[PDB]
Amino acid sequence: KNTRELLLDAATTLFAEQGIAATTMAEIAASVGVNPAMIHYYFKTRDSLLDTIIEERIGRIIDMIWEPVTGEEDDPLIMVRDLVNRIVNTCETMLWLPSLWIREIVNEGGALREKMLNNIPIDKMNKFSAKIAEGQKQGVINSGIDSRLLIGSIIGLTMLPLATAKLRDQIPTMKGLSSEDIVCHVTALLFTGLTNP
Amino acid sequence: NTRELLLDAATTLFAEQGIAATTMAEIAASVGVNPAMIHYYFKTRDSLLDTIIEERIGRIIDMIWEPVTGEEDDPLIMVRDLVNRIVNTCETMLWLPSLWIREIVNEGGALREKMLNNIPIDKMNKFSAKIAEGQKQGVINSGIDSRLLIGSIIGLTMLPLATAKLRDQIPTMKGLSSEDIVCHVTALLFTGLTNP
């Protein structure tokens, strides 16, 4: 059926398992039993494939996480609760996303790092930072936290435990924690912190 | 000291372009030293990595977890001191957040396997026991996990410094200094987003 979509799904899977630099376009085609002549037909250069990953795979994942964000939310605490849920639910369905995030975005030698910068949802992130800062002015949100740095904090608290899941499964006094066991921890930490209510 | 100069050159080049891509001939040439000297101090490529784990990573890991005892009377002072020691170390040694993501967090890392046999399991168990003791007393939130908090603190402190170069290429995200990071993370870990 659709050869282009099959090879893009094969590209994201192989890049998440062993990295971009190590994976050749000949390997991606062979992994789905497709002739390497077809991968160069849909993607002229190696750079053209990465641009399609950023637009038709990464971009679609980034938009579905930040699109329900408006500037009219009446409760900032519901807005963050929903964002945390959408990040963990996306990573639980699309297992390639947390692994590809550390390897190619966070890493300084990542191939998708530079291309990512020109596809950041700056408009909806500014709306999130404005809504959470409005809550700080009203006194319903903690005055000590930073409205801009909170985006990074939420991403770090949700994405990193799933990316390091295989690593903690190897540490003796650390193994025995699920996707549900982690989301409870992040929600309890973001809302109440360490001081008991 | 040629040995120390080449070890500083090794950690810098591995943080900039990775281990797999960096040759021992490139490390020696980057400091104007003959490649005959790097094989003199480090017999194998594996010996160089073991020295990085013992004399560079290990020293950094020990100085962050050594002030942690089991006798802390206040668990929140213990977490704010830990946060301060992580950010202060990363601010002085810029290669640390970079080398952490590239070779231990990453599944294809060269230091990943060697790091497992140098984890401060004893002092981490003391941290998890002290924070769990606070949960029993009812002074610490019962909802959070004593073991997962270690990862949470590492994630809240290490990741913003690892993504600093990425943030710097964003206009609306530019300006946030290192002192701004430690204040946000402390206010988030202590009180969270809610107010009474």
**Which of B13, B78, B118, B148 is most worth mutating to test chain A (most A CB atoms within 10 A of its CB)?**
B148
CB contact under 8 Å between A185 and B148, yes or no, is: yes
Q: Of B104, B107, B128, B193, which to mutate for an interface test with A (greatest number of A Cβ within 10 Å)?
A: B193
Is B141 close to A22, i.e. CB distance below 8 A?
A: no
* Domain A1-197 in CATH 1.10.357.10: yes
Picking from B114, B110, B106, B90, the residue whose alpha carbon sits closest to that of residue B22 is B110
Amino acid in the structure at residue B40: Y
Q: Which of B106, B131, B156 sits opposite A156 (nearest CB)?
A: B156
Residues 6+ apart with CB under 8 A from B114: B49, B50, B53
Nearest CA-CA distance, residue A41 and chain B, Å: 30
Q: Which residues of A touch B193 (CB under 8 A)?
A: 76-77, 80, 132, 141-142, 145, 150, 190-191
Closest CB to B138 among A168, A174, A196: A196
Residue B186: its chain A contacts at CB < 8 A? 144
CB-nearest to A192 from B16, B143, B160 is B143
Question: Is A195–B190 a contact, with Cβ atoms under 8 angstroms apart?
Answer: yes
Contacts 24+ apart (CB under 8 A), A120-128: A120/B170, A121/A62, A121/A63, A121/A66, A122/B170, A122/B172, A124/A66, A124/A67, A124/A69, A125/A66, A125/A151, A125/B172, A126/B172, A127/A69, A127/A70, A127/A71, A128/A66, A128/A69, A128/A79, A128/A83
Q: Which two tokens stand for residue A151?
A: 């985006």
Smallest CA-to-CA distance from B148 within A6, A176, A153, A23 is with A176
Which residues on B lie below 8 Å from A102 (Cβ)? 101, 105-106
- B192·A196 Cβ contact <8 A: no
CA distance B12 to chain A (A): 13
Q: Do A182 and B148 touch (CB under 8 A)?
A: yes
Backbone angles phi, psi at B21, to 5 degrees: -80, -25
CA distance B53 to B115: 7
Residues B7 and B1: their CA atoms lie apart, in Å, by: 10
Q: Are B99 and B14 in contact (CB under 8 A)?
A: yes
DSSP B62-97: HHHHTT--S--S-HHHHHHHHHHHHHHHHHH-THHH
Chain A CB contacts of B180 below 8 Å: 146, 149
User: Which candidate, B156, B63, B158, B148, places its Cα nearest to that of B105?
Assistant: B158
In CATH terms, the superfamily for domain B1-196 is Tetracycline Repressor, domain 2 (1.10.357.10)
Q: How far apart are CA B66 and CA B87, in angstroms?
A: 16
Residue B49's Cβ-count burial label (10 Å; 0-12, 13-18, 19+) is buried
Resolution of this entry, Å: 2.6
3-class secondary structure per residue, A92-158:
HHCCHHHHHHHHHHHCCCCCCHHHHHCCCCHHHHHHHHHHHHHHHHHCCECCCCCCCHHHHHHHHHH
Spacing of C-alpha B90 from chain mean position = 7
Integer Cα distance of B165 and A108 in angstroms: 8
Strand partners, B140: A195
Contacts of A195 in chain B (CB under 8 A): 76, 139-141, 190-191
To the nearest whole angstrom, how far is the Cα of A111 from the nearest Cα of chain B?
Answer: 12
Chain B CB contacts of A167 below 8 Å: 104-105, 112
CA atoms within 13 A on the CB side of A82: 14
Flag if B193 and A80 touch (Cβ within 8 Å): yes
CB contact under 8 A, B141 and A192: yes
Q: Do A152 and B163 touch (CB under 8 A)?
A: yes
Residue A83 to residue B186: CA distance in whole angstroms: 22
Across the interface, do A171 and B105 touch by the CB < 8 Å criterion? no
CB of A4 closer than 8 Å to CB of A42:
yes
Q: A160 vs chain B: nearest CA distance in angstroms?
A: 7
Q: Is A74 helix (H, G, I), strand (E, B) or coil?
A: coil
- Provide the β-strand partners of residue A141: B194
* Dist. CA B64–CA B166, nearest whole Å: 26
d(CA B110, CA A111): 19
